[PDB]
Design a protein around this ligand. Structure first.
Ligand SMILES: Nc1ncnc2c1ncn2[C@@H]1O[C@H](COP(=O)(O)OP(=O)(O)O)[C@@H](O)[C@H]1O
Ligand SMILES: Nc1ncnc2c1ncn2[C@@H]1O[C@H](COP(=O)(O)OP(=O)(O)O)[C@@H](O)[C@H]1O
Ligand SMILES: Nc1ncnc2c1ncn2[C@@H]1O[C@H](COP(=O)(O)OP(=O)(O)O)[C@@H](O)[C@H]1O
Ligand SMILES: [Mg+2]
Ligand SMILES: [Mg+2]
Ligand SMILES: [Mg+2]
Ligand SMILES: [Mg+2]
Ligand SMILES: [Mg+2]
Lengths: 106, 526, 538, 525, 211, 49
């Protein structure tokens, strides 16, 4: 890399490319799936999430948990989006969609 | 706790004694030295940087001094006297500053020698009286009807400015404008070149195209394009009131309960506009100028009668138009009469200069107001030319008011100095020494002229003094260009007596004022 | 002997934040380097095998796309020369709708080869003149490279086949289904008059069922609900009002002046009776659907419910005019009943529930109408946005085909043929312009090279094979992306065809941008300002 | 220093320091603007604080976009601004001549010579040069070919050869269209409109008006064949009473009656327009177009559209005069007495849409006295550059038409003037001969810079041209392709006589005033 | 901007015309300062150090050392003048003046597009011709007392006041003649210079011994 | 047009803390004023009184 007195893009622009960035995307999707993994089945459990104001939400629904997480990873947001889509179209299976997508990527 | 106790407030300074007098004299000398080199036909210009980003490239002393911000109160007094000299007679601004500085310089010597300032002030006042007497004695009369003499006087006034290259055109412009502005009504003579001799500067063109118009010129266009931009012999009606429907002074609210009232009220607004336009038209004018807006409907009604309208003209411009074309500004068009209609303009022409429209009401017969159209390289050049023209017009009006003249080129200074020394030769008291000091300090003008010319100051000044010691040599000065002694009857450099009197009085009075002062106190609020 | 002072003159007078670049090395080479960097940034997303890029702009908005114009728009390009090239790409997008990546890569290749020519000894003027001559030669050659024409635009199969190539670059895996949808939508539009309006194709995005569930609707879809008790009409007679569904009031000021008890007791009853009479008069024309652009009064809604009138409120005036075009209605400015020639008609208007969003559907049974809507389904908002971009590309391709029906082979066949012909023309030219002409011809190799690089094969072997085949005399042979090894195949038979206008405008704009960048010799940059955007951008 | 003593925070440069500061600033400006001169000059890209890109070759545009905070630079910029405002050309030559005058004067001042003698020599040389310029001008009837040559001379120096060739025909035809015999040319009647949808060579001349706004009603016709034009300045939208009227009603029916009667004032004027349209054209072939400077509310728009009338609102103020001159109607401020004789005529009116904005074309006028130049280009900076180029070309053609004389270009008149000044130098008394020589050498800068920009060497090309001029007496300039002397009059390289006269006057005045400055003060704080 | 500034961002660089203008400006500033030193009619300069010590001089080398200058071209010219003073002991002011005027005259033609190499070639040819002419014009003479007196006066009158120069002329001539041996190099280490601070400046003299 | 740059040459080459006074008014008059001030300070202690 060279200083290039006049830069192409403005300072602070971060770029990630190649195989490592897609492996990182897969890892982020794995993390998102793990965030709701335990809430599946008749022996599933509930998660408690506290927002900034201090109110807590207790839920077994995968879509609710994913919405309450402030996910900012661009690749990991796709799992939240498909969970919302499954909730909208069907209403059930919002955990299975994330588990299956992350398992495909893994 | 236990705050300090003291009589005068904090940050209240005070200086007293010889230190205050020395500081005041040094401040005056510094102010004089600032513009010492801007005197004479060979003066060099100074470029001033205005705080607001502008540039003032000038040779006038007053402009340079007023562009400078100072802290010492003596310097403030010097700037004030320069401004007063500029306002009173129109020139002599850089001469009075130098004279005051020299007088204070020669007074410092007596202050250092156990002489009370009151004695110095008394000697200065006696000297000033004799200076005025000698100046009035060595004066000569002038025939104001002689155009050549007036032109030569204006030339001698503007030989030291940057306009000396076009001196002939500048003198003709100044003389014509001053003689055009001259007015007399109800037995009161008046030459108001501040309000009726307007200088308009349009960058571009050449300075040889600049001229004084037999009329006025404003930066305005027709309200509607259908109106004529060229009328041969226009009858001009001047207004200072709106030609549009406006709310009344009292609070007024309508109340509509029937259907037709709204349309009726709008039709009454239109009918009021029509009535105003008809009242204007009844005088059969050719052009209408007002200071307030003109509605579109009013424009239509005026165009139906083939009338050109200019919408928003400033009060001063409207007054100049009234003076130039012989009109009378009216407010209510229903009271317009035939006398108020302005006939006397010989042409109305709205032409385009560069990328802007300008309205010309020139070709007037016997106009009492005029505009001076200036063309030049840039805005700063035009500003300097305007300052030089102002100096020329002020000198011309001073000569018109007082037809006396005195020799220039330092001849008057040396003549008055010799007369003062001869008078002092009979003095016996202690006052004679400061008297002679003032007399000799008067010689700072020819010395400055010689220094600016580049000649030898000592030899030329000694020769001039020896020449003035003779009998008929009061008109012998120094040639500011060739650096040689010459009779002012040959060189022709004469200056108005009023300007010299004002310069001398202001210099002596400033010296007296600054000598009276001691014990400077500062730091207090209001 | 410690510091090097600024040279007297312009160096000292320059402002503290300003920058000045002059001369070949300091200006032209830097501009070429910046443009090459931008071209390299966008190169990888070229062709059917191009890869999407996640771009997050300054507002934390995520874009997943392989559209070059969108990527350049979201990127915050700061270098002025790269800004100029981006302007050229956006102009190509506006004029045609496709070929922005072609413009970018061609400009980058042209500027790189211009730098090479400048280094070997040529001057800027000679390079520019050679580039202009070669561009004129290319625009002369291009009409001869046309292999086929559309020859029919009212056929679903033909239009779908034509748009397959256009929308194969994006959404490579499933382009036949999208081509069929866009073909149906475009054929519904484009009446007997030859004019075709791109804005007549609307896109509705509803989450839930994957993009394979998308469909085309001959009408309008609005994401809202009816405001009355009626939710379905079978023989709709829409009446459209641009005014609020309420009794109109004076524009000056309204004041109810009451002077007696009778007026006070009768005012509300009279207002109710008047509004009831107005609604009954509207309903007496048979209008069973009322669409308004303003608010709806409670009494108005009550009387509409009483007379079995469907009420739909369209907040935006653009949607109101689109609905008026769809149903053939006139936006009445007053609440008067519509005359027979200004009442809209629709085969069916009903309230539906797609996914989890309530929608109001204006449906035409006929396969015609002024406006047709494509209903997009999907599991992600970004996916539907990318599908919408592909739909826009297909619609723009159809518009271009309406403007000009000529087609040129794709897959790099046209670029290789142009390069060969311009190179052959290069030797015939004596003088220093031959180097610039040859470099202009070589710059066309960047298209097949990028395609081969993205497809995963060796670009050099592909280009060698393409030259061999084109020297044999086959001008319709391009890169075969359906292979694991460098291979070529005929593009006319495979149906991979590019629009003539797209290539023409892309070549012209790329050449103009490269030449204009080359013309710059000195750069004077002011100190950057931290102002919150000019007021012009709102 | 005295000023620093009185004002501690004062910046002063005195005498030789002042002269050095001024001359250094002038030399820096000259060094920057040297590369602009001639068609072979280089192009500069200017980036503002907001990132706006501007490509230019003007001396004035460069001067304003240069990031300079110098007093002498400000003075020279003001001089160039006045030059551009009046003549419209010669700003780069202005800066170059000022800088070279200052340099040549400093050449002698550094040898102990006083600037006053140099200024006197400058004055004498300026007078002689003006006399020679009067002698050398070519008074020719301004036919179309000469105007084409002048416009080409300006535009080739301003833009590329092909774009210059297109703009030459466009500018000359536009000027000739609005020209009236022995009448001053009003450049306000040539509207310049920018569109950003095609190539730069697509710029052309429309013998009519192009308006950047279209009809606001979707049902109005987008194309009218035979159109009557009604240019009006009458408000067709609702207006409130000036005296705070307000309405008072006691029932809903009364409110409805008041609402219906509220718009009768506007409806009366709309009905007057409709009645006039019905009277003039009873068939559908003839069209009616209403261009209104004021606004039109949707009710009046619908009422007009139902009668097949195309209505445009919020037109430009100058467009009233432009439409009156082109179409041939009468701009109306009221509809009190409107008759068919107040209607203009247009042989074709149609609306062109480009992106979000819409444009209206009014073409096929009988004999339009106001035309429009449609600037087309793919970029905003291209449009700005073409706009500057057409401004320069229009100014050049108008100047050439104004005074029938025209001056040969390519620096031929500079060389001839320098030779004449050298010949006249012995007649000047005193030491002002040095100032005269400095003025001649400064005048010689234009061929020097032209040869330098063309890639040749200054000394050899200049001496060759001077020898050719002396041997034959002809007006020979610089051939920018070969470097040999060339007769500018025969080839067709022309310069405006007024531009040269303004150059001489302004350059001499500003150089004389700068040379006489012996102090720069900044003590206003 | 430049290539150097890319590798080292905080590097100060002047290229081509910029570097030449910087060098010529520094040389012209040095020449402008040292113009007033030349000749017996030159003006005395007043130098105050950081500690406050006062030094009055007209010498070019001393003035060059005591000016508060931080320019590279000034450093090179100072080195040249220092070598001049170390070897010949005179001509430093003329050295600076000639260097500055040479640079100015060269810039007179370089600003007209001429390459500096041609100017340097002309400089070399002119220097050769000038050396030949100087060899032709030198006045070979028998160095009697009068000629040495004239030379010493020609130096000291420029250096100091006329009467003090007249005294120092005899002093230095007699001192040199005392220690000079026939056909042997003169060792100036054998003339002690001792400072005493009690009498007037004209009381300085030569002692035929040691102090 | 808001600041006055240092003159090219010696003025720009001068060090940050250095001062240069040249010419009659700038040097000789200032020196004479300083000497006069010193003499004034010591003057009042001259003679028996
Ligand atoms: N040609 C000349 N020769 C000699 N003295 C002149 C000449 N012209 C003007 N003067 C003198 O110069 C003075 C005017 O100088 P000026 O710059 O106008 O100062 P001020 O602004 O104070 O009037 C007059 O007193 C006059 O005597
Ligand atoms: N099936 C295919 N086989 C080979 N090449 C193809 C195929 N489909 C499209 N292309 C090529 O892809 C290119 C289009 O790239 P694209 O990503 O659309 O860039 P742009 O949007 O700038 O046109 C065309 O030049 C075409 O030759
Ligand atoms: N084709 C040409 N051949 C030779 N000289 C030319 C040609 N065109 C213009 N010139 C010269 O170039 C000058 C124009 O330079 P220009 O860039 O217009 O500067 P400015 O805008 O300040 O006039 C004119 O003086 C003219 O003599
Ligand atoms: Mg479940
Ligand atoms: Mg005066
Ligand atoms: Mg594409
Ligand atoms: Mg030009
Ligand atoms: Mg010596």
């Amino acid at each position: 890399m060279m200083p290039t007195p006049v830069i192409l893009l403005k300072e602070g622009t971060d770029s990630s490319q190649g195989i490592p960035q897609l492996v990182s995307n897969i890892s982020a999707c794995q993390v998102i799936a793990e965030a709701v993994r335990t809430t599946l089945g008749p022996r599933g459990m509930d998660k408690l999430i506290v927002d900034g104001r201090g109110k807590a939400t207790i839920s077994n629904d995968g879509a609710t948990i994913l919405k309450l997480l402030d996910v900012v990873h661009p690749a990991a947001k796709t799992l939240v989006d498909i969970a919302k889509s499954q909730d909208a179209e069907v209403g059930d299976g919002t955990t299975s969609v994330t588990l299956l997508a992350a398992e495909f990527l893994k | 706790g236990h705050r300090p106790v003291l009589v005068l407030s904090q940050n209240t300074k005070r200086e007293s004694g010889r230190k205050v007098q020395s500081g005041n004299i040094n401040a005056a000398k510094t102010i004089a030295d600032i513009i010492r080199t801007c005197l004479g036909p060979k003066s060099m210009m100074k470029m001033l940087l205005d705080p607001m980003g502008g540039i003032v490239m000038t040779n006038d002393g007053n402009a340079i001094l007023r562009e400078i911000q100072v802290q010492h109160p003596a310097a403030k007094s010097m700037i004030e006297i320069s401004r007063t000299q500029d306002e009173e007679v129109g020139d002599g601004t850089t001469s009075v500053i130098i004279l005051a500085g020299e007088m204070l310089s020669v007074a410092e010597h007596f202050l250092e020698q156990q002489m009370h300032p009151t004695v110095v002030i008394s000697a200065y006042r006696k000297a000033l009286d004799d200076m005025i007497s000698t100046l009035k004695k060595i004066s000569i009369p002038v025939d104001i009807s002689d155009s050549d003499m007036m032109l030569n006087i204006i030339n001698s006034s503007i030989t030291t400015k940057a306009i000396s290259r076009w001196s002939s055109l500048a003198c003709n412009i100044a003389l014509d404008a001053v003689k055009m502005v001259q007015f007399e009504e109800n037995g009161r003579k008046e030459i108001d070149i501040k309000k009726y001799a307007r200088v308009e500067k349009i960058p571009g063109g050449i300075i040889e195209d600049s001229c004084v118009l037999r009329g006025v010129m404003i930066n305005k266009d027709v309200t509607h394009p259908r109106m004529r931009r060229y009328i041969k012999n226009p009858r001009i009606v001047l207004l200072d009131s709106s030609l549009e429907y406006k709310k009344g002074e009292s609070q007024t609210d309508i109340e509509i309960t029937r259907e037709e009232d709204f349309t009726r009220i709008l039709q009454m607004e239109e009918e009021y506009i029509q009535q105003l336009c008809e009242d204007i038209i009844q005088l059969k004018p050719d052009v209408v100028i007002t200071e307030k807006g003109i509605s579109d409907l009013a424009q239509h009604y005026l165009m139906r009668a083939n009338i050109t309208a200019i919408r928003r003209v400033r009060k001063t411009d409207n007054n100049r138009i009234a003076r130039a074309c012989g009109a009378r500004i009216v407010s209510r068009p229903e009271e317009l009469r035939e006398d108020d209609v302005g006939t006397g303009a010989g042409l109305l022409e709205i032409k385009k200069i560069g990328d802007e429209y300008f309205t010309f009401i020139t070709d007037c017969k016997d106009p009492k107001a005029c505009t001076i159209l200036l063309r030049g390289a840039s805005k700063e050049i035009l500003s300097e030319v305007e300052r030089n023209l102002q100096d020329a017009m002020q000198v011309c009006r001073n000569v018109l008011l007082d037809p006396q003249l005195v020799p220039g080129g330092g001849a008057s200074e040396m003549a008055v100095a010799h007369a003062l020394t001869e008078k002092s030769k009979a003095m016996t008291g202690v006052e004679q020494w400061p008297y002679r000091a003032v007399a000799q300090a008067l010689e700072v003008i020819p010395r400055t002229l010689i220094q600016n010319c580049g000649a030898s100051t000592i030899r030329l000044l000694t020769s001039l003094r020896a020449k003035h010691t003779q009998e008929n040599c009061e008109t012998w000065g120094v040639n500011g260009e060739t650096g040689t002694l010459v009779d002012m009857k040959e060189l022709g450099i004469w200056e108005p007596l009023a300007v010299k009197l004002q310069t001398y009085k202001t210099a002596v009075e400033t010296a007296v004022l600054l000598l009276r002062i001691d014990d400077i106190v500062s730091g207090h609020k209001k | 002997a410690l510091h090097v002072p600024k040279a007297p003159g312009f160096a000292q007078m320059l402002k503290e934040g300003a920058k000045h670049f002059s001369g070949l090395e300091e200006a032209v080479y830097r501009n070429i380097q910046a443009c090459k960097e931008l071209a390299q940034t966008t190169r990888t997303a070229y062709g059917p095998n191009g890869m999407n890029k996640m771009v997050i702009n300054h507002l934390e908005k995520l874009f997943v796309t392989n559209d070059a114009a969108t990527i350049l728009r979201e990127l915050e390009v700061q270098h002025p020369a790269a800004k100029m090239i981006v302007m050229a790409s956006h102009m190509q997008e506006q004029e045609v709708g496709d070929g922005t990546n072609f413009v970018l890569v061609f400009a980058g290749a042209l500027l790189e080869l211009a730098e090479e020519l400048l280094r070997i000894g040529l001057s800027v003027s000679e390079v520019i003149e050679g580039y202009e001559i070669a561009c004129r030669k290319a625009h002369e050659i291009l009409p001869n490279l046309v292999c086929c024409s559309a020859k029919n635009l009212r056929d679903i199969d033909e239009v779908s086949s034509l748009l397959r190539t256009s929308i194969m670059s994006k959404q490579y895996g499933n382009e036949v289904f999208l081509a069929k949808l866009i073909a149906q939508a475009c054929v519904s539009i484009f009446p007997d008059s030859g004019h075709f309006n791109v804005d007549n194709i609307r896109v509705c995005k509803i989450l839930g069922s994957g993009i394979s569930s998308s469909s085309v609707l001959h009408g309008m879809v609005f994401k809202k609900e009816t405001e009355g008790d009626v939710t379905s009409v079978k023989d709709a007679k829409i009446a459209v009002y641009s005014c609020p569904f309420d009794g109109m009031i004076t524009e000056t000021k309204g004041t109810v002046l009451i002077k007696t008890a009778e007026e006070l007791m009768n005012f509300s009853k009279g207002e109710e009776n008047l509004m009831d009479a107005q609604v009954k008069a509207i309903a007496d024309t048979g209008a069973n659907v009322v669409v308004t652009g303003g608010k709806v009064a409670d009494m108005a809604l009550h009387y509409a419910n009483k007379y079995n009138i469907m009420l739909v409120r369209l907040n935006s005036k653009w949607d109101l005019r689109r609905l008026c075009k769809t149903v053939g209605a006139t936006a009445l400015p007053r609440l008067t009943p519509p005359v027979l020639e200004e009442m809209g008609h629709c085969d069916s208007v009903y309230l539906s529930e797609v996914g989890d969003t309530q929608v109001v559907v204006f449906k035409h049974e006929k396969e015609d109408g002024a406006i047709s809507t494509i209903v997009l389904r999907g599991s992600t908002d970004n996916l539907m946005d990318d599908i919408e971009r592909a739909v826009d590309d297909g619609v723009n391709t159809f518009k271009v085909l309406t403007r000009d029906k000529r087609l040129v082979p794709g897959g790099g066949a046209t670029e290789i043929e142009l390069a060969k012909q311009i190179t052959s023309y290069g030797e015939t030219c004596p003088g220093l312009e031959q180097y610039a002409i040859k470099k202009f011809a070589e710059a066309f190799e960047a298209i097949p090279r990028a395609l081969a690089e993205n497809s995963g094969v060796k670009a050099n072997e592909v280009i060698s094979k393409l030259y061999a085949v084109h020297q044999e005399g086959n001008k319709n042979v391009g890169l075969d992306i359906e292979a694991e090894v460098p291979a070529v195949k005929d593009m006319l038979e495979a149906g991979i065809l590019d629009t003539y206008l797209g290539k023409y405008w892309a070549i012209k704009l790329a050449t103009n941008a490269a030449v204009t960048v080359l013309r710059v010799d000195q750069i004077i940059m002011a100190k950057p300002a931290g102002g919150p955007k000019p007021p012009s951008g709102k | 220093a005295a000023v620093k003593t009185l004002n501690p925070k004062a910046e002063v440069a005195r005498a030789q320091a002042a002269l050095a500061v001024n001359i250094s600033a002038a030399r820096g400006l000259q060094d920057v603007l040297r590369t602009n001169l001639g068609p072979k000059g280089t192009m500069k890209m200017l980036v503002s604080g907001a990132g706006d890109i501007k490509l230019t070759k003007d001396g004035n545009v460069l001067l304003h976009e240069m990031q300079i905070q110098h007093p002498t630079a400000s003075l020279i910029a003001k001089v160039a601004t006045a030059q551009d405002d009046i003549t419209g050309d010669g700003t780069t030559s202005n800066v170059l001549i000022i800088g070279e005058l200052l340099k040549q004067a400093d050449l002698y001042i550094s040898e102990g010579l006083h600037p006053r003698i140099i200024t006197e020599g400058f004055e004498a040389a300026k007078e002689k040069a003006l006399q020679f310029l009067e002698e050398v001008k070519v008074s020719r009837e301004m036919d179309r070919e000469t105007l084409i040559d002048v416009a080409r001379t300006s535009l080739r120096t301003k833009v590329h050869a092909e774009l210059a060739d297109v703009l030459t025909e466009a500018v000359v035809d536009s000027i000739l269209a609005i020209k009236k015999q022995d009448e001053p040319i009003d450049l306000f009647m040539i509207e310049i409109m920018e569109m950003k949808h095609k190539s730069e060579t697509d710029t052309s001349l429309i013998r009519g008006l192009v308006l950047d706004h279209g009809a606001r009603h979707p049902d109005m016709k987008k194309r009218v064949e035979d159109a009557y034009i009604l240019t009006c300045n009458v408000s067709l939208e609702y207006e409130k009473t000036e005296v705070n009227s307000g309405f008072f009603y006691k029932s809903a029916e009364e409110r409805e009656k008041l609402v219906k009667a509220e718009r009768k004032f506007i409806e009366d004027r709309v009905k007057k327009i409709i009645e006039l349209k019905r009277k003039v054209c009873g068939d559908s072939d003839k069209g009616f177009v209403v261009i209104n400077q004021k606004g039109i509310d949707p009710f009046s728009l619908d009422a007009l559209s139902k009668e097949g009338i195309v209505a445009l609102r919020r037109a430009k103020r100058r467009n009233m005069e432009r439409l009156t001159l082109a179409c041939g109607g009468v701009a109306l401020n009221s509809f009190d007495d409107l008759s068919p004789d107040c209607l203009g005529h247009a042989g074709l009116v149609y609306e062109y849409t480009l992106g979000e904005e819409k444009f209206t074309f009014i073409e096929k006028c009988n004999n339009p006295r106001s035309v429009t130049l449609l600037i087309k280009g793919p970029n905003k900076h291209t449009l700005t550059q073409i706009k500057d180029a057409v401004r320069d070309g229009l100014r050049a053609v108008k100047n050439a038409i104004d005074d029938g004389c025209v001056v040969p270009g390519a620096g031929a008149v500079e060389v001839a003037m320098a030779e004449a000044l050298i010949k006249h130098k012995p007649s000047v008394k005193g030491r002002a001969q040095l100032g005269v020589q400095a003025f001649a050498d400064a005048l010689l800068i234009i061929p020097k810079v032209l040869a330098q920009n063309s890639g040749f060497d200054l000394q050899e090309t200049l001496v060759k041209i001077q020898a050719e001029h002396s041997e034959s007496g002809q007006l020979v300039g610089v051939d920018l392709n070969t470097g040999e002397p060339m007769v500018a009059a025969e080839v067709g390289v022309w310069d405006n006589y007024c531009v040269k006269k303004q150059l001489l006057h302004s350059c001499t005045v500003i150089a004389t005033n700068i040379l006489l400055v012996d102090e720069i003060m900044r003590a206003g704080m | 901007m430049a290539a150097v500034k890319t590798l080292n961002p905080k590097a100060e660089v002047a290229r081509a015309q910029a570097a030449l203008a910087v060098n010529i400006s520094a040389a012209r500033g040095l020449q402008d300062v040292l113009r007033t030193n030349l000749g017996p009619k030159g003006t005395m300069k007043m130098l105050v150090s950081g500690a406050g010590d006062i030094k009055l001089t007209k010498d070019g080398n001393v003035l060059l050392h005591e000016m508060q200058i931080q320019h590279p071209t000034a450093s090179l010219i100072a080195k040249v003048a220092t070598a001049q003073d170390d070897i010949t002991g005179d001509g430093t002011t003329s050295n600076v003046l000639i260097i500055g005027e040479l640079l100015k005259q060269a810039d007179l033609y370089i600003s007209e597009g001429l390459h500096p190499r041609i100017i340097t070639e002309g400089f070399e040819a002119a220097k050769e011709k000038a050396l030949q002419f100087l060899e032709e014009v030198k006045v070979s003479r028998e160095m009697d007392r009068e000629t040495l007196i004239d030379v010493a006066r020609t130096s000291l009158r420029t250096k100091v006041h006329a009467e003090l120069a007249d005294v120092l002329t005899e002093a230095v001539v007699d001192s040199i003649l005392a220690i000079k041996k026939q056909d042997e190099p003169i060792d100036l280490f054998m003339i002690e210079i001792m400072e005493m601070k009690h009498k007037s400046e004209t009381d300085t003299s030569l002692i035929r011994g040691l102090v």
